[PDB]
């Protein structure tokens, strides 16, 4: 059986820029040569960026297989790590019938006896006699079923945890920010997209508690904020309020497939809703049933007035328009209804999720109307300063040099090669760069107003509507979306008013 490989079914160019171990001497992705990795990428993305220790040589403890000395020293050097490890199922893997049962199957799969899982097992590289940061590939050596079900996130595409480090550094405005001296301004980015090679991200480090991985709080350090208020929308919903006040009577020791709805959980968790796969079957990843995925990709069931009618502009990389009523998504919706039907009527659940669809249709319509206003100003040459007197699209030189029509299609790449990126890019997926980085008069004021409309307030109302939080739905969502439309119209009228004066002054 092939050893666990996180980069299975990936081309050699992709593994050369994402898996092959550079030090901190280089970046990652197609623009790896345009920036250098942040220091903590040793720990966030070990395969690509980890470097060996430099202070105390650990080789002699590995070379003579002195597992005991790892504990004797770190018992006093880092007592917290040992206290976690001594309390984990890795130290006591045969202490309960459940633990003894899962351990027995693992012993057969690895051909070894496992009375304990030691620091040596996770950290000691035997061939090179060096200390190692264990990626998911090491964990998959024993937990092969969980590794493969995690690997199945590739089947639905981005966004997901498997390809999390890809999305971080593949966008061109990451390297551009590092070019201008703001590499470490993206500190939270590398820390939040680190769930690609680290399996300690939900069930945290050295306790590795399935109980902790199953409670909703394990996801809330990452899933919060203006572009995905998942923690706030769930936590403040009736589902979350009941969980927070009845958590003592929730049995988190039971795996999800054994959880009796109503008796073990009164209200569902993030893991119960999202790790459900279909037809009473659960899976060790939360992304299989996504439909409106992030709330950014426009649905194909709408007729747009802006250039969204031509999205995704022949770009092979980014996702095409989502068909909400496709056979695949209707089945996905039915899988959701199987979850909700355990505590609600099908009618009440289907009526609610149909309202989620209606909110998203009108929200994407509202965003399209705002994008039409911004693009008409561009077409009328009222953008000030114009594309000629402002910085180009972020990393336009690297896009031309590193990408091709194989990535972006002929019309999109031809414009970059011909105009060297001296044109505006507005709207879903690739127009969001201004959310992250401000270059010389690029973006303008009105472009980031629209950006906040479709990437902040549409997404907050989306997550509030989907997670049954009425305040997040309206007051973090629709109402701020209407307010940016107010600012966009006033700015459009302001730019036309100024131009109407610059003409009658000639």
């Amino acid at each position: 059986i092939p050893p666990p490989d996180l980069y299975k079914d990936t081309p050699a160019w992709y593994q050369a820029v994402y898996k092959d171990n550079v030090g901190l001497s280089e970046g990652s992705g197609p623009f790896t040569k345009y920036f250098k990795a942040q220091m903590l990428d040793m720990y966030w993305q070990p395969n690509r960026h980890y470097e060996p220790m430099e202070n105390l040589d650990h080789s002699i403890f590995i070379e003579q297989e002195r597992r005991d000395l790892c504990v004797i020293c770190h018992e006093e050097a880092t007592p917290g790590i040992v206290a976690d490890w001594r309390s984990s199922g890795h130290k006591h893997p045969k202490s309960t019938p459940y633990l003894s049962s899962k351990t027995a199957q693992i012993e057969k799969n690895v051909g070894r006896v496992l009375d304990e899982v030691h620091c040596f097992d996770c950290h000691a590289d035997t061939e090179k006699n060096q200390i190692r940061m264990p990626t998911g590939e090491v964990c998959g050596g024993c937990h092969r079923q969980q590794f493969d079900e995690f690997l199945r996130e590739r089947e639905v595409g981005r966004p997901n945890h498997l390809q999390s480090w890809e999305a971080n550094t593949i966008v061109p405005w990451y390297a551009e920010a590092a070019r201008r001296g703001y590499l470490y301004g993206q500190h939270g980015c590398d820390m939040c997209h680190s769930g690609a090679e680290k399996c300690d991200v939900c069930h945290t480090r050295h306790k590795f508690s399935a109980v902790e991985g199953r409670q909703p709080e394990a996801c809330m350090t990452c899933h919060m904020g203006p572009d995905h208020p998942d923690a706030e929308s769930y936590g403040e919903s009736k589902h979350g309020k009941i969980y927070e006040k009845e958590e003592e009577h929730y049995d988190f020791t039971k795996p999800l497939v054994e959880v009796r709805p109503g008796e073990d959980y009164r209200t569902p968790t993030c893991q119960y809703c999202h790790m459900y796969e279909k037809h009473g079957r659960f899976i060790h990843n939360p992304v299989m049933k996504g439909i409106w995925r992030m709330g950014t990709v426009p649905p194909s069931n709408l007729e747009y007035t802006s250039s969204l009618k031509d999205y995704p502009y022949g770009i092979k990389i980014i996702a095409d328009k989502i068909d909400i009523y496709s056979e695949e998504n209707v089945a996905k919706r039915s899988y959701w209804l199987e979850v909700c039907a355990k505590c609600h009527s099908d009618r009440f659940a289907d009526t609610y999720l149909k309202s989620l669809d209606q909110f998203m249709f009108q929200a994407h319509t509202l965003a399209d109307q705002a994008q039409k206003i911004v693009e008409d100003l561009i077409a009328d040459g009222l953008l000030y300063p114009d594309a000629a007197n402002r910085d180009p699209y972020p990393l336009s030189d690297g896009i031309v040099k590193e990408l091709s029509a194989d990535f972006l299609g002929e019309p999109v790449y031809n414009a970059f090669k011909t105009l060297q990126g001296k044109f505006p890019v507005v709207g879903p997926i690739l127009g969001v760069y201004g959310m992250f980085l401000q270059m010389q008069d690029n973006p303008s004021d009105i472009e980031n107003m629209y950006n906040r409309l479709w990437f902040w307030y549409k997404l907050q109302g989306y997550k509030g509507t989907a997670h049954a939080q009425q305040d997040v739905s309206w007051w973090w969502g629709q109402a701020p979306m209407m307010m940016e439309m107010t600012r966009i119209q006033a700015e459009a009228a302001r730019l036309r008013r100024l131009a109407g004066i610059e003409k009658t002054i000639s």
Binding site: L56, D57, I60, Q64, L69, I72, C73, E76
Partner: protein
């Protein structure tokens, strides 16, 4: 085996590879990892060793140093170095000695005579309880039960200027060894560099066995 007086190239390398990261490149207890380490690694340049068979203020014998290297120091990152060979541990003894001028001018005092450990009884334990709590008031630094939470505990300091709050010894992991002879040795020799003095003068040989028996009684 035989511990050399001469410094060797092997002794330099063993110290470099296995001791310098903590104790420093020149034995000043100022390796990089010493900034975040507690207890701090020993500064060998002062010639002050906690664990000896020699009286208070004296240098350690070459055997005292070799013993601490082999056994390690519990309640600290000082692991046993039984992983190293007999000769390797012996070749670094002069390297540690070369860090302090005191080793070149003075000779280590003669080792004390342990004698025969007295038989612990209900009588000897209560005589040690009286010394511990009334005659010498050890609960000042160590507390009534030896938990290290006495009134004067938090304010104690090294001769190197570092806080040395007496660790809870009710676990039985004494830094110099958990033997009744080891604990008796500490009370007979004192811990050089720390506010823990020698009681060889305040107490007789028998009274320090009484005290040792009561200290062992506080273990769980």
């Amino acid at each position: 085996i035989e511990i050399p007086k001469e410094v060797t190239e092997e002794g330099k390398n063993v110290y470099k590879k296995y001791c310098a990261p903590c104790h420093g490149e020149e034995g000043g207890g100022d390796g990089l990892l010493s900034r975040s380490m507690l207890p701090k690694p020993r500064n060998f340049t002062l010639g002050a060793y906690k664990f000896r068979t020699t009286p208070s203020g004296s240098l350690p014998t070459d055997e005292d140093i070799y013993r601490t290297i082999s056994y390690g120091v519990p309640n600290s990152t000082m692991i046993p170095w039984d992983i190293l060979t007999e000769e390797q541990r012996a070749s670094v003894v002069p390297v540690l000695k070369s860090f302090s001028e005191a080793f070149e001018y003075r000779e280590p005092e003669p080792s004390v005579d342990v004698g025969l450990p007295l038989r612990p009884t209900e009588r000897t334990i209560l005589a040690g309880k009286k010394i511990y709590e009334e005659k010498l008031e050890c609960w000042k630094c160590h507390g009534v039960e030896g938990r290290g939470d006495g009134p004067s505990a938090s304010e104690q300091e090294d001769d190197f200027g570092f806080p040395i709050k007496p660790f809870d010894f009710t676990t039985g992991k004494f830094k110099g060894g958990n033997s009744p002879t080891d604990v008796y040795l500490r009370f007979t020799t004192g811990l050089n560099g720390t506010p823990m003095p020698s009681f060889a003068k305040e107490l007789s040989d028998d009274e320090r066995w009484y005290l040792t028996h009561y200290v062992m009684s506080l273990v769980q």
